[PDB]
Amino acid sequence: ENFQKVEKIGEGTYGVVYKARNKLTGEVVALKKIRTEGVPSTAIREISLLKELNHPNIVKLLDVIHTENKLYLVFEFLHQDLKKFMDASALTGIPLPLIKSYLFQLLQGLAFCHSHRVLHRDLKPQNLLINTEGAIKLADFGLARAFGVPVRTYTHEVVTLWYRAPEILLGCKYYSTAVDIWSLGCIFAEMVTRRALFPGDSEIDQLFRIFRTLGTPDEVVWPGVTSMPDYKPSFPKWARQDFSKVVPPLDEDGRSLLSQMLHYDPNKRISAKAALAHPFFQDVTKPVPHLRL
Numbered sequence: 001e002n003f004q005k006v007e008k009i010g011e012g013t014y015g016v017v018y019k020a021r022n023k024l025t026g027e028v029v030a031l032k033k034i035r036t037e038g039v040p041s042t043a044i045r046e047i048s049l050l051k052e053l054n055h056p057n058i059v060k061l062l063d064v065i066h067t068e069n070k071l072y073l074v075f076e077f078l079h080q081d082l083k084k085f086m087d088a089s090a091l092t093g094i095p096l097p098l099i100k101s102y103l104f105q106l107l108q109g110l111a112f113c114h115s116h117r118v119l120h121r122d123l124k125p126q127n128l129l130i131n132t133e134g135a136i137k138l139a140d141f142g143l144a145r146a147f148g149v150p151v152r153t154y155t156h157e158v159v160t161l162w163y164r165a166p167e168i169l170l171g172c173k174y175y176s177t178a179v180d181i182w183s184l185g186c187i188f189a190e191m192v193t194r195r196a197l198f199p200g201d202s203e204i205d206q207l208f209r210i211f212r213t214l215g216t217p218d219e220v221v222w223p224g225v226t227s228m229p230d231y232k233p234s235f236p237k238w239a240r241q242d243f244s245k246v247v248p249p250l251d252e253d254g255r256s257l258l259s260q261m262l263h264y265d266p267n268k269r270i271s272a273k274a275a276l277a278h279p280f281f282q283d284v285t286k287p288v289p290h291l292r293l
């Protein structure tokens with residue numbers, strides 16, 4: 001009521017987003033409404049902690065408003081998300097130096113969050129936001145841990161499994177920072193090829209798409225995998241794909257970085273910090289995108 005809804009930005013992870021102007025300050029912000037027993041107070045404290053997260057590559061959380069017994073998050077507003085940008089770039093593709101710059105910044109954001117013991121758990125093109133100056137920022141960090149993990153969005157919309165790490169699909173109870181690196185790996189592949197890497201339409205389809213590409217994991221590549229809660233010995237055994245087939249025509253530095261982000265074993269999977277030192281980034285620059293707003 002102290003905001004004017006300018007528009008509905010979209011339908012998000014834990015709820016719906018709006019572009020709002022604050023009549024008081026005239027400042028334009030993104031306003032996220034979260035789903036009702038009167039709310040948990042655990043989530044409120046944890047999310048409140050996120051306000052202290054400040055990094056150039058993290059969308060700033062401005063306020064957490066608990067009032068009239070509902071929860072609103074107030075975020076700095078950015079004009080476009082990576083999903084829309086990829087669709088807009090689908091004819092020509094995103095130039096390699098911009099993909100590289102975007103990946104580099106995203107890993108910086110992740111390195112920062114992970115070093116503060118904050119996980120995203122939900123990464124996807126919709127929650128990566130871009131501006132006219134060439135920056136890219138991660139949004140909705142730590143929301144997943146605060147709350148629980150739904151099989152739906154808010155009300156009747158289909159949750160994206162495409163970016164989900166295999167340890168999550170296999171029913172692992174404890175997430176690590178590795179799940180964010182996996183998601184980012186999928187997004188990197190998607191910027192390069194202009195199609196989603198693993199567009200699963202169900203949980204098992206998601207798993208089997210990963211298996212058909214990277215090979216069905218076994219105890220050799222992933223010690224402990226056959227003991228995972230949802231692991232079935234009856235899984236079909238697919239041979240790993242020639243990797244040059246996965247993301248053509250990305251060069252070998254990029255392919256090498258991607259393979260390290262996509263390791264099955266969360267323990268072998270590269271860290272955001274280590275990834276920043278990969279030779280892929282030796283020539284990194286910061287180009288400006290062509291943005292139609």
Ligand SMILES: Oc1ccc(/N=C/c2c(O)ccc3ccccc23)cc1
Pocket residue numbers: 009012017030059075076077078079080081084126127129139140
């Ligand atoms: O055409 C578009 C216009 C504005 C957009 N902003 C989305 C956004 C934001 O500007 C700030 C924080 C967020 C947090 C979660 C999800 C989206 C956002 C996206 C596409």
